[PDB]
Structure 1
C-alpha cells in the first residue's frame, strides 16, 4: 500500500465515521457540555470580547450539519492514524513476545 493510499483511506474512513457514525454522539456531547461557563455566564457573556463562538466558520451547509471544524477534527484523526499506520509498518520491529 502506497502512503498516499494509506493517508487517503484512513482520512476517508475517519471523516466517514465523523459524518455518519460518530456525529450524533459528538454533537449531543457538545450540546451537553455546551460552552465553558465562567461563573454561570459563558466566557463571552462575562466579557473579554474575544471568546465568541465563531459562526461564520460553523454555518456551512450540510443536511446533517457537518462543518469545517469537524472536517479538521475528523481528518486530523485521519492523518494521525494514517501516519501511525505508516510509521508502525515502515519500522521493522519484532515484538518477539514469549521467544
Structure 2
C-alpha cells in the first residue's frame, strides 16, 4: 500500500464502479442506438467482411447487469490513465524547480 498502489488502485476501482453502477445504462443505450458499423445499409459482416464478425465472447458475461470483459478492460484502462495522470502531476509539483501554476 504505497502512494502508487493507492492512486492506481483507487482510480481503477472508482472507474470500474462508475462504469458498473453509474454509467452502464448511458453507455449501453448509446451503444445500442449507434449500433454496428455499416456500409451501404448493411453491417460489415453482412457486406462480406468475415473479419468483422462480432466477437462471441464480448457479449455474454454472467454479470447480473451485463458487465463483460471488454467493459472491464475499458474502465480499467480509464482508471489506470487517470491514476498515472495524478501520479505524474504530483511528481512534477513535488520536484523542486518545477511549478506549472499560472501565478
Q: CA deviation at 1:55?
A: 1.8
TM-score w.r.t. the length of structure 1 is 0.92
Partner Cα distance (2:88, 2:102) in 1: 21
How many corresponding residue pairs? 98
Runs (4+) of structure 1 exceeding 6 A deviation are: none
Q: CA deviation at 1:96?
A: 4.1
Q: Deviations over 1:42-97 (max 9, x none)?
A: 00011111101112233111111000000000010000000000001001232342
Unaligned runs of 5+ in 1: none
RMSD: 1.2
Q: CA deviation at 1:2?
A: 1.0
Look up the SS of the partner of 2:56 in the other structure.
coil
Larger proportion of helix:
2
Instruction: Write the mapping of 1:66-81 to structure 2, written as runs, cut at 5 A.
Output: 66-81=67-82
